[PDB]
């Protein structure tokens, strides 16, 4: 006799993300050596961490300009990988292919001013729960925030904390979403001395515990 | 056995109190993991369907039982009888993704398609009821789902809770009785 | 397990068959089991058999 | 050559309660930790034992009222999970999903009266074999029964024994069934002193050897 | 790649007596204990040996009557499980479900007479080869035979030997079969004293080496 | 077993393939076997061969 | 491997399933991994907590 076997209904169909392998047909090919080829990367986040990219402001510039007027709120944006300001970053470029995330996102501010341009800035994370972000450093001061001044060192880095009810969050934003689900980031200018027209470049990168899960192919094709 | 009923402390007397012998029992069939581990039909369907265990029938063995718990957790298995190819998408995906083939897409193979899916919500556990004053910017949070599926047409959908975990039991009701003493019904018997 | 009775080991790795549960520290966290086992069984008072 | 195999007729169809598992397609997902989440239950009967629920009497009250007249039979009901009086209990809620059972069902009586309301009750299990339950404590006395009085302790628990020819019994009742197949339970009021209008709450729970077997999905859908 | 397999033509069909088992669907049922239930039997022949049953004679009586006339041949019958006389025995009841047999068949004679009724009988096995069974004890005497008289012991048992060319024989009889293929058994009455109208009960049972092979379902349904 | 001849071990666990028998204490409870083995085989009386 | 979860060993030899990579001398050549691990994590300057 031979081995009895039940061919089960429901199984066997092809699934585009299945964990199997096809049967081979053209054997014994030895590839040209690619030993030690430069610039390899094995995890997207390794580059997302090492290479920060720029946010988009105003007209479409990668920086913020010091206000000469009495307004101190330099910029404000949604803490969302789908944020308009984050739309040109590599981080968002990757994020679109995942459903959820958690972790620290790092922001980098780099002053472009002249040696005689001086300033003092403040960045704050406004968690959700308030109706509108405060346009005043005084009001924002009550949030997790940091201030720093211009000097020998041009760059200042700040980590946007992951604080939410659920352990993960959506990288995308639903149309019903009125106020950003994860809050805002506000950048203020405490003061400046002869810093009119000078610039503040801001970029973003993944933090040590930034994580993306659940691959997704969402773009229109 | 008398006790202070008010304290709500559990009291389980036994027939030994009046001369009996308590016997041996085997409760395999009332094991949560086991009992919830069978397929159940989802009645409302549409070419695009978001998997939500609450669409389960409220008097079905699985539905009733699920509803008799406040919080739960499980992986899932589905069986779908569909026309064309079936595409699944994880919790949190933009509806638009369902059109793309690089998302788990099972090519049509008769008679239907049986799949194994993972819990994919962002919460540590889900709920059958959620007392949200709002929960926004009998409605349960949108995040309470197992992803979505789409095909040219979806004729049947069976769902199966794997590794079920139930917490905080709540009311489980039987058929209400109008009859003077018992609910009587035709029980199978040979002809 | 519950309602699974395959003698033979699974063909796909565990990390594909199921989602991987994580911890921050299954256990005997069975409130109801504890609760039921704690039920008073005896008899309150004096007995005359 | 390759492995000969016979695909057997009769096997392979899908069966809603089968003991297999589907093939996976979306791997490597790590769930948020749910370590030590409260209120878990792994067996229905564990809760069925720990949480007793109420029987339904008269109008639809979870209690029995002390008769001021000369009748001593406070209540009587079929020993059946399909009993009208048991219709609101969690025990019956579960039982409907199983075909058979065996074991002890426990009843709990909790006096609600005033400190100056006094009474003496009696509960008896009338096994099957008689045509009609006795309306007198004197007649019922010949059955397995227990009496108890009002006092410091408000609750009194009694176990309804499993006594039948077969080892198991049906949780459901056939329409041809005239007299309840497993007998009745009768609650009497021996006497009372100034206990008019006072109440006796009765609930039920699973006993140490209560058991349900053979899952069933019987409700109309 | 995956495992190559050849689904063989000719295999897989259902066969009513196959040596396989179906796939299960309703697991974990524990039966009520049936430990030590009385009267169990595991092999038909064990009962066929222990419980002898009656042959059918004349009108349809389980016995033979002592002839008052000068005829000494009390009874004669074909050594066949399909014999008319064997038609009511449990042995034949079983035998119909098998194609072949071999072995010893035992006959039992039990005298029913009065204390003052006396007799001497003789049983003989007439193997095949003769045209017709002898109606005389004198002629039959040349065959394997035994004689016994009436006394304190009422029962006398005799074994019909299996003597044939082939190792097995058919339990059924073909229509072309003129003379019984396995011979006859003749019971004679040598003499009797005042034994007129008295009876001799005869029954049959399987012998130590009786054997049935090749199950068969032959009855009209 | 009777009329089962598979060399290879079953794929499904025993508690699914069959119902589990329980006891309250198979054995040599074969009334009929005992009965048949107890049959008198000899010869009652004196022999002259 | 990535997105392959078969417990059972492959039926075809490796030299048929895949192309054979050759060398002239995988390693920890992960520029970006090194790069990311080399990121300054501390704090430049004096602290007053």
From Swiss-Prot, chains C, F, G:
It comes from Foot-and-mouth disease virus (strain A10/Holland/1961 serotype A) (FMDV). Lies on the inner surface of the capsid shell. After binding to the host receptor, the capsid undergoes conformational changes. Capsid protein VP4 is released, capsid protein VP1 N-terminus is externalized, and together, they shape a pore in the host membrane through which the viral genome is translocated into the host cell cytoplasm. After genome has been released, the channel shrinks. This is Capsid protein VP4. Myristoylation is required during RNA encapsidation and formation of the mature virus particle. It comes from the Viruses. The chain holds residues 216 to 286 of 2332 of the full protein.
């Amino acid at each position: 006799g031979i081995f009895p076997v039940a061919c089960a209904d429901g199984y066997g169909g092809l699934v585009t993300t299945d964990p199997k392998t096809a049967d081979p047909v053209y054997g014994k090919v030895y590839n040209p050596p690619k030993t030690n080829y430069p610039g390899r990367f094995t995890n997207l986040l390794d580059v997302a961490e090492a290479c920060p990219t720029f946010l988009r402001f105003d007209d479409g510039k990668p920086y913020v300009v010091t206000r000469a007027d009495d307004t101190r709120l330099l910029a404000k944006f949604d803490v969302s990988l789908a944020a308009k300001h984050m739309s040109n970053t590599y981080l968002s470029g990757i994020a679109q292919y995942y459903t959820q995330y958690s972790g620290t996102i790092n922001l980098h501010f780099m002053f472009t001013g002249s040696t005689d341009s001086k300033a003092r800035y403040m960045v704050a994370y406004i968690p959700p729960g308030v109706e509108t972000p405060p346009d005043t450093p005084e009001e924002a001061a009550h949030c997790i925030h940091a201030e720093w001044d211009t000097g020998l060192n041009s760059k200042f880095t700040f980590s946007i904390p992951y604080v939410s009810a659920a352990d993960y969050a959506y990288t995308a934003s639903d149309t019903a979403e009125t106020t950003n689900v994860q809050g805002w980031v506000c950048v203020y200018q405490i003061t400046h001395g002869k810093a009119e027209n000078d610039t503040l470049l801001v970029s973003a990168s993944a933090g040590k515990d930034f994580e993306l899960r659940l691959p997704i192919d969402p773009r229109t094709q | 056995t008398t006790t202070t009923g008010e304290s709500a402390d559990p009291v389980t007397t036994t027939v030994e109190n009046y001369g009996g012998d308590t016997q041996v029992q085997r409760r395999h069939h009332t094991d949560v993991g086991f009992i919830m581990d069978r397929f159940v039909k989802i009645n409302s369907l549409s070419p695009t369907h978001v998997i939500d265990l609450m669409q389960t029938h409220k008097h079905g063995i699985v539905g009733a039982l699920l509803r008799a718990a406040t919080y739960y957790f499980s992986d899932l298995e589905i069986v779908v009888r569909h026309d064309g190819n079936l595409t699944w998408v994880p919790n949190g995906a933009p509806e638009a993704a369902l059109s793309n083939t690089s998302n788990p897409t099972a090519y049509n193979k008769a008679p239907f398609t049986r799949l194994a899916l993972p819990y994919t919500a962002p919460h540590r556990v889900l709920a059958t009821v959620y007392d949200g004053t709002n929960k926004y910017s009998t409605q349960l949070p949108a995040s309470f789902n197992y992803g979505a599926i789409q095909a040219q047409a979806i004729h049947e959908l069976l769902v199966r809770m794997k590794r079920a975990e139930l917490y905080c039991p709540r009311p489980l009701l039987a058929i209400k009785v109008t009859s003077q003493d018992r609910y009587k019904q035709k029980i199978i018997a040979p002809a | 397990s519950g309602n699974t009775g395959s003698i033979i080991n699974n063909y796909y790795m565990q990390q594909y068959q199921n989602s991987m549960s994580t911890q921050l520290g299954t256990q005997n966290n069975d409130w109801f089991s504890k609760l039921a086992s704690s039920a008073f069984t005896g008899l309150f008072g004096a007995l005359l058999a």
